[PDB]
Write a protein that binds this ligand. Structure first.
Ligand SMILES: [Cu+2]
Ligand SMILES: [Mg+2]
Ligand SMILES: [Zn+2]
Lengths: 269, 307, 145, 392, 307, 250
């Protein structure tokens, strides 16, 4: 299978990037520091759960968009895309191989960070039951890898459209700024400026249009704690959906964007 | 036959790009493609490579359809400007391309000793010059056992020695049954290694054939110069009896232009009287034939001191 | 720093730092806090140790001086006897009338502190175990009922 | 000290009721009989420069309507005007203009005093150290002072060791302390007005006293000073525009205990409320914190909840929503940050105040709840103003 | 005489990149610098342009020092692979360079008509191809009235017709009095246009002279290709006994590798026995002379299949 | 003079930049919004918030302008061409500095006159005497801060050899001179539990030009003119260092 050949090239290409290594080391040391702060303040479990969720939300889209902002537009202007099209390959094989390689890099970074944090929690806090810790941290790695794959597909969509790498970097910066900061500030301004009198039924349903809030709604299901620890995500308690609908919505956010990236890459010539 | 393009009239919508191109490539030929106006050469490139589907006619590469795996494992393509992956090394890029083409990995060693990259197989591609990247592109082009090479400017940035050695390797490959298509804008330099030339203008194919049949079809003046001639005053007028204009630029650098129909009597006149030093029999080269065939398709010479 | 050790004499218009009341109007020992800028002055020792237990003033380089009642009369203390408050003997629970909080009478010797614990039934203690809860309990048991 | 009957005693009615006519008199005077003297406008009882002007030692005296002027100023001799002994009982002074440099109305043990509606405008001289007290109450029980008007004195309505009396409608202007209470168990003051006073209402070492409806307009230093008071009730007060003189605090809680602070209104001050570290666990719910530069000062790391029975306070800088439509916000309000605690601990951080790193730190506190220290937050804050009648 | 290098020896530290170079360019002459082993071409190139200083030697460009402000106003330079400011137009860049060079702005549009960039003069050069960027880099090089031009690969990416017109423009500028130095790694294409050659080995200067002097100094063979004069096998035997090679090709083609020292007698018999109607006699060209002159200083030939 | 001949080209090339136009439009929009929020709720809070916004964004604009001034011209191949012209290395750097400084002055003039016009239109009874003086000092200090970071970009561009490393060094310069210095000063304040010398902190506040801008716009044992002299010294020393780096490259 040529998909594994493209993925084997992409793994060794992406593991030699130094910005990725620096940001993954920063993520690991920040997760260790947040775990040590939670252990020192320990019951402070929802505070450190929300802090780890916010750290992963701020850092893992950055890792995915730094990996895949030049996957298609960097091959086309590098002259190797036409060469690969003359090789016995399709376009779905190239896209699937790049997605598999970058997803393996994302899963490796997630596993390193949330293994270091779990080891720090296990060594620091005495008498901690492993039945909650293993379940919560496994949910953390699975949802973090899903969020990274969401932004990988976003980067593939934004890279298959442009014809220059600088515009791809600008669109990646705009995508990172829009989904992380701008959407929550827009929702907060809509809630504050209307005092909760602007469509009270439809407003909790707008949280499903941002994957970075579905991630925190997944990871704040077990330990709500206090109502001030979420801000706008206190609107998520009014959602009548069960817990698996958020997982299905994250999978749909992967799939729809991957199909759109395949359509754009197929049309592009 | 290797390439059997028949009746292709490829269009980009409301305008006609290619118009009734009938090109038959044999086995062991180093036929070259020339042309600068219009996208006639590039559309033919993508038609042979299978990147473009013909709107009319049929393209047959190596007997089969040009988008099959069995003809894409037997085809070598060297593009114009390939940057490659700057973080990978020389061995890893060639191993990746050999795994993609399904070739053997041991050849990855031999090809790296075949062009120039035995010493620099461990350094990254970001520390490579233009000629080194051309060597790497040739090395991935010769992967496996290709039966049709489609090189696009193979000697841009290369050595004056490696150019000669690349053409020697191309002659070795054409002596074993492979067929090469050379595209280049440097017409002096490829005219000593091709077997056929195809000139394209305004989408149409103006002339095809060998370099002797092109000179037979195109009546052009032969530009013979007898440098170091013994006598020049009667050499100004002894060639003009049969219509060969005798124009000189130095003490003895006279470029007599003939009519290509009286070559025996001019050589008899040159050899019976007067002793020469180094006669340059300047036949009409590929540049002059290209100029004539662009003029025949409709063109005007630029003014003095222009372009 | 040698500029944080001199005790400033009490004037007739000196105001307490917390209550703001005229200091030289009430009996009992007073309190002074000299850091390297100007002096804070208090009308009672129990209103000072209340100021000292706050987290803002704890990390300061202020020297605390308290009036010595073993060489002075309770009705009118004199500024000549101003001992260091960190090395002092505080007897609490006495029925003597203070100024603002508990009647923390300060001494520098064993015998007079043992006496004022004796014929008033109070307890003698040091500087470092002065706490907020003990101050509130002493104020409730002295000014309640 | 001549007797009060030395002046011409024309007698209107036969229940020991006399009527002093208009005109000026001189010297000190003393009442020793149960008399019911009622003066006329123009009866000036101006003494020379010294002595108690009207010394009352008699039960059931209903002196009413004098124009006492220029009594003494010797405070250690207590040179008052209406010095009233414990031997006198049921004093009922009413409606007399008063001007002098000493004590206004001094009572030192009389039960059931009824000082009602007097103007005790003092002298504008002296450095306010020796201006004297208008309405000094020493060791009093059962008194009731109503509708008085004290102006330009020292720490005027001064209550010292009194078990049970009522304060109502007293307008106090240009004094040091508005109402000063020291050791006053089971007390009550209702609807007092305090303008341009140096610290306003000072409550020091009292217990079980009720502070209801009193206003405080344009004070300085402190609006209401609370010192060592226990089991009290602070309900319905209105503190407005406390300027610097301290930096200006509407409420200053120091070494206090289990009181009830509800339905107040602290506005336009540099500090809405300053809670000391030793005073914790007070019932604080329903107040209005509008217009202040900083609302709560609590320099500690112990958590404090400021909402009882599910209802909290109104905060002007609160940014929240009420989707359930119950009147109470849907997110908790944190009045303080960690950078505020760093500024309160280390003042040199005042230099690093407008830095971008400060805003980065505040955003880090908002995004990462682990680094947030426990504070003075209240769950369910109000969305509208709870007190409107206090705004009038 | 422009460029009067009189014994420079440039050393980048302990090793000497350039060692004892004695070049003397004439007035109205065309020189071609060739060489790839050491960095002797680039260091002498920077020495002429004034971007470097000789450690031990003298350079005289146009009579004066190479870094004079009056010398640099009459000097043209076309560098390698230059891309201009991509957000500026084709006319604003030329106006900027004319203001920097102290030329007249009224020349500028004339140059935009001379190099063929008249239609694309109001578009940004980020939309330019390689050929039009080379035309813009030539148009800035002909600014003012230059007396010495230094072009490095001037015909890369250009059309063959544009290449021929560029060489015609070079000869027209040479006739007025300017002196041109072209650097190229492709030797067929400039061989008919240079008046003098200069081959540089690893820090040394091998041979300077015209092509006739280089062919006289180097005992290089002459290559004759004929298509059926009388017979291949009948003409195979005649060159063999006289000391020349005769290649046994397939059919109806005679290849003669002769010594060009006794050919004055030899071609008379070829005239007398048959027709010259399909023949081409090639003197040893620039590639063969380059191969010989870099074989003379080391650099042994490669294998059967290499480079 | 060739300085103006290079400055006109630098003006055109900087005004035809997409990233600069986008960041300047966002800066003007944020300044208008901050002026609107200050007018709806007076003078010194709006001045402080605009100073924080300028301290955030004006190093970013000045580093976006000139991170590829020397290394980008070297990679494009026109740096070798310009040295063969009758030109000097000082004149190239001076012309680039003049052009980029004019671009930054135009940017602050647009994005600050918009805020001043919004303040004058929305809030009335605020007159013009204090507003003109405060805003004139504000834009002059903003231009000086932009020129400081312009000279920093000219220092960092001449040292590197590749354009990608210049972006990383510009990001490190932006991070170190805005966030890192004040954070480690605050950490030195906290960890020394209050016995730090109070005469030393306002004089190590002079080692970062961003807090010199805040001390100018927030009006401190220093007088009111030594801040301006320190800002001019921060321009001049970095410009001399950039010239010394440029004169020794290649
Ligand atoms: Cu008091
Ligand atoms: Mg609610
Ligand atoms: Zn006090």
């Amino acid at each position: 299978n040529q998909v594994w050949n493209i993925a084997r090239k992409e793994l060794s290409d992406g593991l030699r990037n130094r910005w990725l290594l620096a940001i993954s080391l920063l993520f690991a040391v920040l997760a260790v520091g947040i775990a040590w702060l939670g252990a020192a303040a320990s019951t402070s479990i929802p505070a450190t759960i929300a802090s780890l969720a916010s750290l992963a939300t701020f850092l893992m889209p950055l890792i995915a968009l730094l990996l895949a902002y030049d996957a298609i537009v960097g091959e086309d202007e590098g002259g190797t895309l036409m060469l690969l099209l003359t090789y016995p390959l399709g376009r779905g094989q190239i896209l699937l191989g790049k997605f598999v390689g970058h997803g393996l890099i994302l899963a490796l970074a997630v596993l390193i960070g949330f293994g270091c944090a779990a080891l720090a929690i296990a060594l620091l806090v005495e008498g901690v039951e492993l039945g909650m810790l293993f379940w919560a941290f496994g949910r953390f790695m699975i949802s973090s890898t899903l969020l990274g794959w969401v932004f990988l597909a976003f980067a593939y969509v934004l890279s298959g459209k442009v014809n220059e790498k600088s515009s791809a970097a600008g669109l990646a910066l705009g995508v990172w700024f829009l989904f992380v900061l701008v959407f929550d500030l827009v929702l907060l301004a809509l809630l504050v400026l209307s005092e909760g009198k602007f469509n009270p039924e439809l407003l909790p349903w707008l949280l499903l249009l941002n994957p970075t809030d579905i991630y925190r709604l997944i990871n704040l299901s077990g330990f709500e704690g206090s109502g001030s620890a979420m801000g706008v995500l206190s609107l998520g308690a009014d959602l009548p959906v069960p817990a698996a609908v958020l997982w299905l919505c994250l999978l749909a956010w992967i799939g729809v964007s991957l199909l759109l990236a395949y359509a754009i890459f197929r049309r592009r010539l | 036959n290797a390439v059997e393009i028949q009746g292709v009239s490829q269009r980009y919508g409301s305008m006609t790009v290619l118009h009734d191109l009938n090109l038959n490539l044999g086995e062991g030929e180093v036929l070259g493609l020339f042309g600068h106006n219009g996208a006639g050469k590039t559309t033919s490139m993508k038609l042979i490579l299978g990147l473009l589907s013909p709107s009319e006619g049929q393209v047959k590469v190596l007997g089969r359809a040009p988008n099959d795996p069995q003809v894409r494992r037997q085809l070598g393509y060297l593009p114009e400007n390939v940057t490659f992956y700057p973080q990978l090394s020389g061995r890893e890029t060639l191993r990746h391309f050999a795994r993609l083409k399904g070739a053997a990995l041991t050849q990855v060693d031999e090809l790296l000793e075949q062009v120039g990259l035995a010493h620099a197989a461990d350094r990254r591609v970001k520390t490579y010059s233009k000629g080194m990247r051309q060597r790497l592109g040739l090395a991935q082009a010769l992967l496996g056992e290709p039966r049709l090479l489609l090189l696009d400017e193979p000697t841009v940035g290369l050595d004056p020695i490696a150019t000669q050695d690349l053409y020697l390797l191309i002659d070795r490959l054409r002596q074993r049954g492979t067929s090469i298509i050379l595209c280049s804008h440097v017409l002096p330099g490829v005219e000593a290694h091709i077997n056929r030339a195809a000139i394209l203008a305004k989408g149409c194919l103006q002339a095809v054939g060998s370099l002797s049949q092109l000179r037979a079809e195109a009546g052009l003046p032969v530009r013979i110069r007898a440098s170091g001639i013994s006598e020049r005053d009667s050499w100004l007028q002894r060639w003009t009896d049969a219509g060969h204009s005798a124009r000189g630029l130095s003490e003895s650098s006279i470029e007599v232009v003939a009519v290509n129909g009286h070559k025996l009597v001019l050589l008899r006149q040159l050899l019976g009287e007067g002793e020469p030093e180094d006669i340059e029999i300047h036949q009409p080269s590929l540049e002059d034939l290209y100029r004539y065939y662009m003029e025949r398709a409709g063109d005007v010479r630029a003014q003095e001191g222009r372009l | 720093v040698q500029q944080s050790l001199e005790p400033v004499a009490f004037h007739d218009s000196d105001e307490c730092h917390v209550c703001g009341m005229i200091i030289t109007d009430f009996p009992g020992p007073k309190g002074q806090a000299v850091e390297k800028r100007g002096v804070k002055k208090f009308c009672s020792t129990a209103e000072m140790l209340g100021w000292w237990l706050q987290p803002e003033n704890r990390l300061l380089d202020a020297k605390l001086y308290v009036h010595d009642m073993g060489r002075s009369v309770w009705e009118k203390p004199d500024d000549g006897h101003l001992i260091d408050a960190t090395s002092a003997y505080y007897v609490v629970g006495t029925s003597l009338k203070g100024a603002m909080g508990a009647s923390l009478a300060s001494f520098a010797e064993e015998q007079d502190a043992k006496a004022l614990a004796g014929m008033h039934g109070g307890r003698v203690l040091r500087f470092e175990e002065i706490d907020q809860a003990l101050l509130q309990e002493a104020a409730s048991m002295q000014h309640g009922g | 000290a001549p007797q009060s009957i030395t002046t011409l005693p024309l007698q209107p009615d036969g229940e020991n009721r006399w009527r002093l006519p208009a005109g000026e008199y001189q010297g000190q005077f003393t009442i020793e009989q149960p008399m019911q003297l009622r003066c006329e406008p123009g009866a000036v009882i101006q003494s020379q420069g010294q002595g108690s002007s009207l010394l009352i030692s008699a039960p059931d005296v209903l002196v009413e309507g004098c124009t006492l002027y220029e009594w003494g100023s010797d405070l250690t001799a207590m040179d008052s005007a209406v010095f009233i002994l414990p031997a006198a009982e049921r004093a009922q002074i009413s409606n007399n203009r008063m001007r002098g440099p000493g004590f206004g109305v001094f009572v030192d043990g009389t039960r059931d005093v009824q000082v009602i509606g007097n103007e005790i405008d003092g002298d504008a001289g002296v450095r306010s150290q020796d201006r004297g007290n208008g309405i000094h109450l020493f060791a009093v029980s059962g008194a009731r002072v109503l509708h008085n008007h004290v102006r330009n004195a020292r720490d005027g309505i001064y209550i010292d060791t009194s078990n049970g009396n009522h304060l109502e409608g007293n307008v106090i202007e240009d004094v040091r302390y508005g109402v000063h209470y020291m050791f006053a168990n089971e007390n009550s003051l209702i609807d007092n007005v305090t303008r341009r006073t140096r610290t306003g209402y000072a409550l020091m070492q009292s217990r079980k006293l009720t502070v209801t409806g009193n206003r405080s307009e344009q004070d300085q230093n402190y609006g209401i000073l609370m010192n060592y008071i226990t089991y009290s009730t602070i309900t319905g007060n209105f503190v407005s525009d406390v300027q610097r003189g301290g930096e200006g605090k509407a409420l200053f809680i120091y070494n206090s205990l289990f009181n009830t602070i509800e339905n107040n209104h602290f506005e336009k001050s540099s500090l809405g409320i300053h809670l000391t570290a030793g005073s914790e666990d007070n019932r604080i719910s329903g107040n209005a914190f509008v217009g202040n530069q900083q609302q709560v000062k609590y320099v500690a790391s112990r958590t404090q909840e400021w909402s009882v029975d599910g209802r909290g306070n109104y905060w002007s800088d609160y940014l929240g929503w009420d989707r359930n439509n119950d009147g109470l916000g849907d997110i908790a309000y944190e009045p303080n940050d960690n950078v505020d605690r760093l500024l309160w601990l280390y003042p040199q951080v005042r230099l690093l105040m407008n830095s971008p790193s400060i805003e980065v730190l505040r955003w880090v506190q908002r995004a990462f709840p682990v680094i947030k220290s426990p504070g003075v937050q209240d769950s369910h804050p109000l969305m509208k103003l709870p007190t409107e009648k206090l705004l009038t």
